[PDB]
Paper text:
The M2–1 transcription antiterminator factor is a basic protein of 194 amino acids that exists as a stable tetramer in solution and is essential for the complete sequential transcription of mRNAs in HRSV. It harbours four distinct regions: an N-terminal zinc-binding domain (ZBD; residues 7–25), an α-helical tetramer­ization domain (TD; residues 32–49), an RNA-binding core domain (RBD; residues 69–172) and a C-terminal unstructured region (residues 173–194). A crystal structure of the tetrameric M2–1 assembly and an NMR structure of the monomeric M2–1 RBD have been determined. M2–1 oligomerization is primarily driven by a central tetramerization α-helix and is also stabilized by contacts between the zinc-binding domain and the core of an adjacent monomer. Given the relevance and uniqueness of this viral transcription antiterminator, we set out to investigate its RNA-binding domain (residues 73–194) using X-ray crystallography and folding thermodynamics.
The HRSV M2–1 RBD crystallized with two molecules in the asymmetric unit. The structures from both crystal forms are virtually identical in the core region (residues 58–177), with a root-mean-square deviation (r.m.s.d. on Cα atoms) of 0.3 Å. The elution profile from size-exclusion chromatography indicates that the HRSV M2–1 RBD exists as a monomer in solution. The RNA-binding core domain appears to be a compact and cooperative folding unit in the crystal structure reported here and the previous NMR structure of a similar fragment. The folding studies reveal that although the RBD shows inter-monomer contacts and contacts the ZBD from neighbouring monomers in the tetramer, these do not influence its structure or stability.
Residue numbers in the entry: 1 to 103
Amino acid sequence: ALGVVGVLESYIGSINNITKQSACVAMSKLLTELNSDDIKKLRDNEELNSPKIRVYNTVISYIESNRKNNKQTIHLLKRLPADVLKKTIKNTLDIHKSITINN
């Protein structure tokens, strides 16, 4: 808990009693920080049948939703079944880590 990354890792890992609401609020903050052009660039570094391309595209779709409306996207994420939400968070965190390391 405390800090976007701490909250999201904790939610995925089922520690620190993170509520669904808190995780989705932190996700919105992370998506705001991510740049979809950066991710499209990472995506295009991949070979044509890399499984990563599909993943990159889902995270691009989250960023685009969040950009149009933060609060609506928080509500949307909160409606995903918890297992679906955690995979969403993991893929987004993974892309955040890649960009951070290579900056």
